[PDB]
Each structure stands twice: as structure tokens, then as C-alpha cells.
Enzyme design. Sequence first.
Site, short mmCIF file in Angstrom:
data_model
loop_
_atom_site.label_atom_id
_atom_site.label_comp_id
_atom_site.label_asym_id
_atom_site.label_seq_id
_atom_site.Cartn_x
_atom_site.Cartn_y
_atom_site.Cartn_z
CD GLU A 1 18.63 80.63 33.03
OE1 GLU A 1 18.62 81.98 33.56
OE2 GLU A 1 18.26 80.54 31.98
CG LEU B 1 19.94 78.74 25.52
CD1 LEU B 1 19.26 78.39 26.83
CD2 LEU B 1 20.36 80.34 25.38
O1 LIG Z 1 19.81 90.31 18.18
P1 LIG Z 1 19.37 89.00 17.92
O2 LIG Z 1 18.50 88.07 18.60
O3 LIG Z 1 18.94 89.27 16.32
C1 LIG Z 1 19.95 89.80 15.36
C2 LIG Z 1 18.83 90.49 14.51
O4 LIG Z 1 18.01 91.10 15.21
C3 LIG Z 1 17.73 92.53 14.44
N1 LIG Z 1 17.99 93.55 15.33
C4 LIG Z 1 18.84 93.47 16.65
N2 LIG Z 1 19.08 94.63 17.15
C5 LIG Z 1 18.37 95.31 16.54
C6 LIG Z 1 17.64 94.83 15.49
N3 LIG Z 1 16.77 95.26 14.73
C7 LIG Z 1 16.31 96.63 14.90
N4 LIG Z 1 16.86 97.20 15.98
C8 LIG Z 1 17.64 96.68 16.61
N5 LIG Z 1 18.44 97.32 17.83
C9 LIG Z 1 18.46 92.51 13.16
O5 LIG Z 1 17.33 91.65 12.27
P2 LIG Z 1 17.38 92.34 10.72
O6 LIG Z 1 18.89 92.08 10.24
O7 LIG Z 1 15.82 91.52 10.22
O8 LIG Z 1 17.05 93.95 11.01
C10 LIG Z 1 19.49 91.36 13.64
O9 LIG Z 1 20.16 90.58 12.68
O10 LIG Z 1 20.69 87.96 17.81
P3 LIG Z 1 22.01 87.22 18.24
O11 LIG Z 1 22.89 88.12 19.14
O12 LIG Z 1 22.60 86.91 16.93
O13 LIG Z 1 21.66 86.30 19.23
C11 LIG Z 1 20.81 85.10 19.15
C12 LIG Z 1 21.60 83.91 20.06
O14 LIG Z 1 21.87 84.07 21.11
C13 LIG Z 1 20.99 83.05 21.97
N6 LIG Z 1 20.38 84.00 23.09
C14 LIG Z 1 19.48 84.84 22.62
C15 LIG Z 1 19.07 85.75 23.88
C16 LIG Z 1 19.61 85.40 25.12
C17 LIG Z 1 20.61 84.31 25.60
C18 LIG Z 1 20.87 83.88 26.73
N7 LIG Z 1 21.60 83.30 26.99
O15 LIG Z 1 20.29 84.84 27.83
C19 LIG Z 1 20.92 83.80 24.27
C20 LIG Z 1 20.15 82.57 20.83
O16 LIG Z 1 19.92 81.33 21.31
C21 LIG Z 1 21.06 82.71 19.75
O17 LIG Z 1 22.27 81.68 19.68
C1 LIG Z 2 16.53 84.47 26.04
C2 LIG Z 2 16.77 83.29 27.02
C3 LIG Z 2 16.62 81.96 26.78
S1 LIG Z 2 16.22 81.50 24.79
C4 LIG Z 2 14.88 80.73 25.18
C5 LIG Z 2 13.75 81.56 26.29
C6 LIG Z 2 12.62 80.91 26.36
C7 LIG Z 2 12.09 79.61 25.96
C8 LIG Z 2 11.05 79.02 26.02
F1 LIG Z 2 10.37 79.16 27.48
F2 LIG Z 2 10.27 79.20 25.42
F3 LIG Z 2 11.12 77.88 26.04
C9 LIG Z 2 13.36 78.93 25.20
C10 LIG Z 2 14.46 79.48 24.71
S2 LIG Z 2 16.86 81.20 28.25
C11 LIG Z 2 17.39 82.83 29.14
N1 LIG Z 2 17.92 82.76 30.27
C12 LIG Z 2 17.94 84.21 30.82
N2 LIG Z 2 18.58 84.25 32.09
N3 LIG Z 2 17.91 85.24 30.01
C13 LIG Z 2 17.47 85.10 28.89
N4 LIG Z 2 17.17 85.91 28.11
C14 LIG Z 2 17.30 83.73 28.28
#
Ligand SMILES: *O=P(*)([O])(O[C][C]1O[C](N2[C]=NC3=C2N=[C]N=C3[N])[C](O(*)P(*)([O])([O])=O)[C]1[O])OP(*)([O])(=O)O[C][C]1O[C](N2[C]=[C][C]C(C([N])=O)=[C]2)[C]([O])[C]1[O]
Ligand SMILES: Cc1c(Sc2ccc(C(F)(F)F)cc2)sc2nc(N)nc(N)c12
Length: 186
Positions: A30, A22
Site C-alpha cells: 500500500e 494509520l
Molecule cells: O489535515 P491534517 O493533515 O492536519 C490538520 C491541520 O492541517 C492544517 N490544515 C488542514 N487543512 C487546511 C489546513 N491549513 C490551511 N488550510 C487547510 N485547508 C491545520 O493546521 P494549522 O492548525 O497549523 O493551521 C490543521 O490543524 O490532519 P488530520 O485530518 O487530523 O489527519 C491526520 C491523520 O490521518 C492519518 N492520515 C493522513 C492522510 C492520509 C491517510 C490515509 N489513511 O490515507 C491517513 C495521519 O496518520 C493522522 O492519523
Molecule cells: C498519507 C497516506 C499514508 S501516511 C504515510 C505516507 C508516506 C510514508 C512514507 F512513504 F514516507 F513512508 C509514511 C506515512 S499511507 C497512504 N495511502 C494512500 N492510499 N493514501 C494516502 N494518502 C496515504
Amino acid sequence: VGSLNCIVAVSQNMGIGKNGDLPWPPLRNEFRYFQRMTTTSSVEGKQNLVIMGKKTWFSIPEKNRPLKGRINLVLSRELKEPPQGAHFLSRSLDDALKLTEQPELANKVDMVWIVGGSSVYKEAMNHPGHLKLFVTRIMQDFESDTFFPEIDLEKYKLLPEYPGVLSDVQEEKGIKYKFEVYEKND
Ligand SMILES: *O=P(*)([O])(O[C][C]1O[C](N2[C]=NC3=C2N=[C]N=C3[N])[C](O(*)P(*)([O])([O])=O)[C]1[O])OP(*)([O])(=O)O[C][C]1O[C](N2[C]=[C][C]C(C([N])=O)=[C]2)[C]([O])[C]1[O]
Ligand SMILES: Cc1c(Sc2ccc(C(F)(F)F)cc2)sc2nc(N)nc(N)c12
């Protein structure tokens, strides 16, 4: 199968991640909100399903994988089976949702929560139908490499309140944030 929902925490410049974590230091409450919202199923004898991308999966620390008390579905076109700990694997969001209307799941899944990352969120948000976004606004800029997609306020309405969601500004390790719920139906 009940509601479709996205949940995210986002900084003011729309940042959700950086270098696989994050953008901000861990906010314990959160994380607790995320846990509570994703886990809690209002239909006794069913579970919620969480759908996430592969990078999001590996971004969660190993000992917290799979997210407990939730059915964990990862999205990947490269993987040939669910990652160690994961329950299900799909090759698209459609298939994932299509997978929920099967015998194995259709009577077990209540809420489905898309928990990131950007491209999952993007596709969901632009899919027709009834969809809520649960958006935690982290009230600063944080340097980010991955971003939440645009929320179209013509379609998504911010709700003035929602049960079990604090309306009030929160603060943890000197970072102000607020919980929001948006709803579309189109
Ligand atoms: O989308 P993320 O999770 O992964 C990318 C990876 O996912 C696969 N992918 C994504 N979307 C699809 C999919 N595969 C099939 N169909 C769909 N629709 C694909 O993998 P492969 O190549 O093997 O097929 C993609 O490459 O990744 P991201 O957007 O890069 O994000 C991760 C980052 O954001 C943070 N994060 C994640 C969720 C929520 C929050 C938040 N603050 O609420 C944060 C993670 O830490 C990371 O930095
Ligand atoms: C994916 C995500 C995170 S990444 C993450 C999620 C869970 C855990 C644990 F509960 F396992 F520790 C760690 C990292 S924080 C968070 N907050 C909101 N509001 N929404 C989300 N989708 C996430």
C-alpha cells in the site's frame, strides 16, 4: 498544471488515522502504491505536487520527509514558514491551488495529489470541477480517530478499471484490501 487528485487509504468504517498514525499495521505494498501514484508524472520534465495538512506531514516519519521526487506543500494557518524539509506552505487549499498558477510552479507542476487529512479531503471533494479519488479500501473495521469524508456516488463514479491500478483483492499481514478510482466532473 495537469490533474487534481485525492488519494487515501480507508478502513470499512471510513477510518484513515489514529493517534497520529494509520489505524492498521503497515502494509508495504500500500505504501509502494501510494509512492508510485504520487510520484509518477506522465509529462517529462515536470514533477507532481503533494498537498497535505500539518498533522499529516508530521505523521510521516522524519527520514521519509519530504516525500521524495515530489514537491511537498503543507497547509497551515499557524506555521510561518514550511516545516524543516517542506517546500511550500499555504494557508488554504485555494491559495495552494492559486500558488500552482504562478511563474515559480505553473511550468513545473504536472499532477497535484491531495494526500490528506480529513478537512483537505472534504474541501477538495466538494470543490467544483474534474477530480479523481484514488481510494484504497481496507476491508475491515479498524479503530480510528480521523475519518475520510462521505463520497457522494451521485457525483463520483467508480471506474471499472484504470491503467496501472490493480483491480484484484490484495492481502498483506492478513488484511484484505482493494484499489479503486472514482471520478467526478461538475
Ligand atoms: O489535515 P491534517 O493533515 O492536519 C490538520 C491541520 O492541517 C492544517 N490544515 C488542514 N487543512 C487546511 C489546513 N491549513 C490551511 N488550510 C487547510 N485547508 C491545520 O493546521 P494549522 O492548525 O497549523 O493551521 C490543521 O490543524 O490532519 P488530520 O485530518 O487530523 O489527519 C491526520 C491523520 O490521518 C492519518 N492520515 C493522513 C492522510 C492520509 C491517510 C490515509 N489513511 O490515507 C491517513 C495521519 O496518520 C493522522 O492519523
Ligand atoms: C498519507 C497516506 C499514508 S501516511 C504515510 C505516507 C508516506 C510514508 C512514507 F512513504 F514516507 F513512508 C509514511 C506515512 S499511507 C497512504 N495511502 C494512500 N492510499 N493514501 C494516502 N494518502 C496515504
